[PDB]
Amino acid sequence: SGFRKMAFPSGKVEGCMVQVTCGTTTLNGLWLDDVVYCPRHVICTSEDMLNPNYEDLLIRKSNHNFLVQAGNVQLRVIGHSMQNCVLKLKVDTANPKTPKYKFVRIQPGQTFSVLACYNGSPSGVYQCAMRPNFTIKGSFLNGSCGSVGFNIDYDCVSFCYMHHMELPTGVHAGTDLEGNFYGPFVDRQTAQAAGTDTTITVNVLAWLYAAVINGDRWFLNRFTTTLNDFNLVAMKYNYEPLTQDHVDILGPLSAQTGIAVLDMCASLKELLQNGMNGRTILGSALLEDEFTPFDVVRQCSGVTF
């Protein structure tokens, strides 16, 4: 049946992307009901990003200093406030294309789709995962702030990420839709350490279950392992410690393929110690960890919205 990195249909999010201009800085905004959400660093100049006093910079700003554009239509700003690191511009008009939505703070290891935008216009969509160090490895250029990450549950759009900065190491950092950064990052142009990134172990196991479903079974060995001895090989190769909760989520994948979770950990343990010897799994020559067990079930069952 095949297996691909798949993103949610971005139709419901395209109708909410607007362009926000404050002075010379222009970035993307998210228009839901009569409130426009955008990163608060839109009020900063190129020289202000070094050490910005956001409370002092926002004081010098009025309602008419914010230009919100939805296509060719201008939105009247009648209120502004700063919640953590996001700016909330109250507009006089509710977005007629507002879908059913919620604000959700996802956990490290979970995945979401990103709609990369520039000047309020969508450019592309791709699937990513929140690394354990609360960073993401996306595709972001200059002007891509304001771009949101989201999950879709049938009719509801769960917004979970807003892009803010590109770290000097090349990775990306951002906040939730309430302004709280993911990780120890601040909206300030300074050298910030992301920390040791590790591999989402439960996502790797789910990806191996998807390989068996699609006929890729060459890595299945003749061993088992304990939950304690497996996390030992995991901690050596910079892998997340596997917990009983992770085993519980892998239940449906273990029952569909008839392979016990502990047996799958043994095949993964052998792959960590012996490598792939040049072979591939689902068209990849490395261990992919950007598919949650829920993503594997969705793609191997055809869940629509």
Ligand X SMILES: *C(=C)Cn1c(C)c(-n2nnc3ccccc32)c(=O)n(-c2cncc3ccccc23)c1=O
- Can residue 41 be called a binding residue for ligand X (CB under 6 A)? yes
Q: Which of 121, 180, 238, 243 contacts a second copy by CB under 8 A?
A: 121
Residue 131 CB-density burial (10 A; 0-12 exposed, 13-18 middle, 19+ buried): buried
Quote the least distance from Cβ 185 to ligand X, whole Å. 8
- The amino acid at residue 64 is H
Judged by CB, which is closer to a second copy: 73, or 286? 286
Q: Which two tokens stand for residue 225?
A: 């392992």
Q: How many Å apart are CA 126 and CA 156, to the nearest integer? A: 19
Binding to a second copy by residue 299, rule CB under 8 A? yes
Smallest separation (angstroms) from ligand X to the CB of 80: 18
- Enumerate residues 64-123 that contact ligand X by CB under 6 A: none
Which one of 143, 174, 179, 293 is in contact with ligand X (CB under 6 A)? 143
Interruptions in the chain after residues (C–N over 2.5 Å): none
Q: Which does residue 41 touch among ligand X, a second copy, none (CB within 5 to 8 A, set by kind)? A: ligand X
Pairing between β-strand 172-175 and β-strand 156-166 as defined by DSSP bridges: antiparallel
**What's the token pair of residue 244?**
């009983």
Tokens of 38: 């955008």
Residue 189's binding partner among a second copy, ligand X, none (Cβ under 5 to 8 angstroms by kind) is: ligand X
Binding at 116: pick from ligand X, a second copy, none (beta carbon under 5-8 Å per type): a second copy
Query: What is the footprint of a second copy within residues 196-225 (CB under 8 A)?
Result: 214-215
Q: How far apart, in whole angstroms, are the C-alpha atoms of residue 295 and residue 196? A: 25
End-to-end CA distance of the chain: 20
Between 41 and 246, CB nearer to ligand X: 41
Residue closer to ligand X (CB basis): 160 or 162 = 162
Q: Which amino acid is at 276?
A: M
Of 30, 38, 187, 296, the one binding ligand X (CB under 6 A) is 187
Give the separation between CA 196 and CA 212, rounded to whole angstroms. Answer: 31
Enumerate the β-bridge partners of residue 161: 149
Residue given tokens 């977005």 in the structure block:
95
Q: Is 288 in the site for ligand X (CB under 6 A)?
A: no
Task: Please identify which residue in the block is written with the tokens 């691909």.
Answer: 4
Instruction: Tell me which residues are annotated as active site.
Output: 41, 145
If one asks whether residue 192 binds a second copy (CB under 8 A), the answer comes out as no
Return the range that interacts with a second copy (CB under 8 A); candidates 2-10, 64-72, 81-89, 219-227: 2-10
DSSP category for residue 98: P
Q: What are phi and psi of 120, to 5 degrees?
A: 75, 5
The single residue among 50, 74, 100, 126 that binds a second copy, judged by CB under 8 A, is 126
Residues that bind a second copy (CB under 8 A): 1-11, 14-15, 115-119, 121-126, 128, 137-144, 166, 170-172, 214-215, 280, 283-286, 298-305
Residues that bind ligand X (CB under 6 A): 1, 27, 41, 49, 140-145, 164-166, 172, 187-189
